[PDB]
Each structure stands twice: as structure tokens, then as C-alpha cells.
Amino acid sequence: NNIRLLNQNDLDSYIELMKFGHHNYEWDRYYLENVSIDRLKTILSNHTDYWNIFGAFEDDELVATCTLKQMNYVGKCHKAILENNFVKNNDEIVNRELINHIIQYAKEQNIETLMIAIASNNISAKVFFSSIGFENLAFEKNASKIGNEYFDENWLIYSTTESS
Amino acid sequence: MNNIRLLNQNDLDSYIELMKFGHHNYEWDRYYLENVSIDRLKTILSNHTDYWNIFGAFEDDELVATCTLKQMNYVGKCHKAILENNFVKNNDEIVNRELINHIIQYAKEQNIETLMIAIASNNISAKVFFSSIGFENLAFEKNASKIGNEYFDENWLIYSTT
Numbered sequence: 001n002n003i004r005l006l007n008q009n010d011l012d013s014y015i016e017l018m019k020f021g022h023h024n025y026e027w028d029r030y031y032l033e034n035v036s037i038d039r040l041k042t043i044l045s046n047h048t049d050y051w052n053i054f055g056a057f058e059d060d061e062l063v064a065t066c067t068l069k070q071m072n073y074v075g076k077c078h079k080a081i082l083e084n085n086f087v088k089n090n091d092e093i094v095n096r097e098l099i100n101h102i103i104q105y106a107k108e109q110n111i112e113t114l115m116i117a118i119a120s121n122n123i124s125a126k127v128f129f130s131s132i133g134f135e136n137l138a139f140e141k142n143a144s145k146i147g148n149e150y151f152d153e154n155w156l157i158y159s160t161t162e163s164s
Numbered sequence: 165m166n167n168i169r170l171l172n173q174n175d176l177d178s179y180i181e182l183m184k185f186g187h188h189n190y191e192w193d194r195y196y197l198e199n200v201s202i203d204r205l206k207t208i209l210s211n212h213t214d215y216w217n218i219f220g221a222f223e224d225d226e227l228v229a230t231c232t233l234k235q236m237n238y239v240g241k242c243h244k245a246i247l248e249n250n251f252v253k254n255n256d257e258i259v260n261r262e263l264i265n266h267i268i269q270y271a272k273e274q275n276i277e278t279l280m281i282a283i284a285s286n287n288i289s290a291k292v293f294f295s296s297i298g299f300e301n302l303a304f305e306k307n308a309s310k311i312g313n314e315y316f317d318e319n320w321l322i323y324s325t326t
Binding site (some may be wrong): 074 | 196199200239240242278302303305307310311316320
């Protein structure tokens with residue numbers, strides 16, 4: 001019972017958790033419907049040094065998941081994006097523990113700031129990440145397009161440095 | 165005069181020469197050159213990354229300006245793209261203006277509806293210029309970039325080809 005770095009040995013578990021973990025909003029349904037198993041196997045490998053999926057485990061079962069994508073681009077390594085937060089049953093006690101692990105890892109890679117883009121009408125998520133310490137950075141009209149239907153996103157930022 | 169086209173692996177020398185002029189007003193050309201790897205340059209230039217394309221302007225056979233278009237090949241994000249590494253010999257505005265037009269027309273052909281570019285925060289020439297092609301400020305990014313232990317604030321500008 002704890003959190004480790006997922007890897008290409010977890011591809012199986014990771015589709016199952018995707019099949020119902022975030023199967024909430026139509027975004028979550030479309031992702032499933034049209035995303036490649038290649039990019040996944042890519043991300044899940046350790047040659048993708050900066051593209052990391054973390055998982056929370058209850059016994060054999062993957063229970064939560066989240067990707068850390070650090071920007072390996074000139075002058076941008078101090079930053080990273082959190083993406084594809086899939087949770088089973090919507091157990092928040094567990095996800096909160098997961099996000100925290102991911103923060104500790106970030107610090108330990110010297111990642112200075114974390115960002116997440118959240119769909120303007122996923123209020124549960126805004127409340128969750130906000131409660132973790134993320135704050136408003138930007139607001140993006142038509143950040144995401146599905147079929148020919150658009151979605152706005154709120155960009156949040158968390159800093160992993162004792163700033164203040 | 166001019167000619168504008170896709171850059172390939174064969175234009176790498178030229179492109180390296182362009183950066184070396186040091187004409188970028190906030191030194192991005194030196195920063196980028198000091199810190200980038202040729203493998204990644206080669207990866208950008210390559211046929212095999214068709215959502216990631218560098219355009220160049222030529223005077224004769226001389227590479228006189230450059231700007232890269234990076235489309236978002238993430239699942240719901242394909243309608244967007246970033247302009248990056250806009251390097252311009254002499255900061256020649258008439259040249260750079262033909263270049264962006266061409267890239268915009270090319271974006272339109274890919275069904276790209278929105279383009280974004282990061283500009284140094286205090287760069288008001290660039291804000292004026294992009295502003296005159298139709299880009300407006302989307303957000304301010306404090307500590308957008310770090311090199312060594314130097315930070316840089318940027319603003320993201322955005323344009324709708326819609």
C-alpha cells in the first residue's frame with residue numbers, strides 16, 4: 001500500500017483505471033476513444049526521463065494516477081505540467097496523497113513550479129487543486145476543441161520554493 | 165529580395181550562422197545556442213516531426229530570418245500551435261512580417277485556429293509589432309525562463325486565424 005513511479009509494466013492496470021477512473025466528463029470519454037498506445041508506452045518508459053506517470057496502489061490495484069511532464073526545452077527545465085489525473089471512485093483522500101508525492105518528487109528534481117490546465121467547468125477539480133495550494137495563473141478561451149465543440153481552461157500554478 | 169520555405173536538415177549550418185549574429189535584442193540567440201543540442205535541432209529540422217517546422221526567409225541563398233511553428237499534437241489541442249525562436253537578421257521588420265504572414269497562411273492550411281508566442285516582458289518593440297499583425301496579450305508569465313540562475317518574465321501573445 002503506497003505510491004511508486006509507474007512504468008511499462010503497468011500498461012495493463014493503466015487502461016483499466018482509465019476505463020472508469022475519469023470516465024466522468026465527455027473530455028474523459030473522448031481521450032479514451034482517441035489516444036495512442038504508442039505515446040503511452042513511450043511515456044511509461046524510463047528513456048522518457050522527464051515524462052512520468054505516478055500511481056497510487058491499494059494492494060494489487062492501481063487506485064489513482066497522475067502524469068508529471070517536465071519541460072525538457074532550453075531554459076524551461078525548472079517547470080512542469082501535471083496532466084491526466086485519473087482517480088478510482090473519486091477517492092480524494094487517496095488523490096491528495098498522490099499529488100503530494102508528486103510534489104515531493106518535483107522538489108527533488110529541482111522543478112521550481114507546477115502548472116495544471118483545468119477545464120473551466122470542472123469545479124470539483126478547481127476546488128481540489130486549489131485546496132492543495134495552486135493559484136490562478138491564466139484563463140484560456142477555447143483551450144481544447146473536441147469534435148467541433150470548444151472548452152475553456154483555467155491554468156493554475158503551484159510554486160515549490162519557500163518564496164513568500 | 166526574398167523566398168520563404170520549409171527548412172530541412174541541410175539548412176542547419178545556415179541556421180546556426182543566423183543565431184550567431186547576436187541580433188536578438190534580449191540575447192535569446194546566444195542563450196539558445198549556448199544551451200541547445202544539435203540532436204534536438206536535427207530533430208526539429210527532420211521530415212519525421214511534421215507537426216514541428218522551421219520556416220526561413222532567404223535573400224538570394226542567404227538565410228536572413230527564421231521562425232518555428234510547433235503544432236500541439238496532444239489529443240484535444242491540435243487546433244493550436246506555438247511560434248518559437250523568431251530570429252531576424254537586423255531585426256528587419258519588413259522581412260519578419262512576410263515570414264509571419266506565410267506561417268499564418270500555412271497554419272490556416274493545417275486547420276490551426278490559434279497561434280501563441282512568448283515574448284520577453286519588457287520587449288515593447290515586439291509587442292507593437294505582433295500587435296500590428298493582430299496578436300494580443302493572453303497572460304504574463306513571471307519566471308517563464310531560467311538560464312543558469314537568471315530568470316526572465318514573458319508574456320504570451322495569441323492570435324486567431326480562426
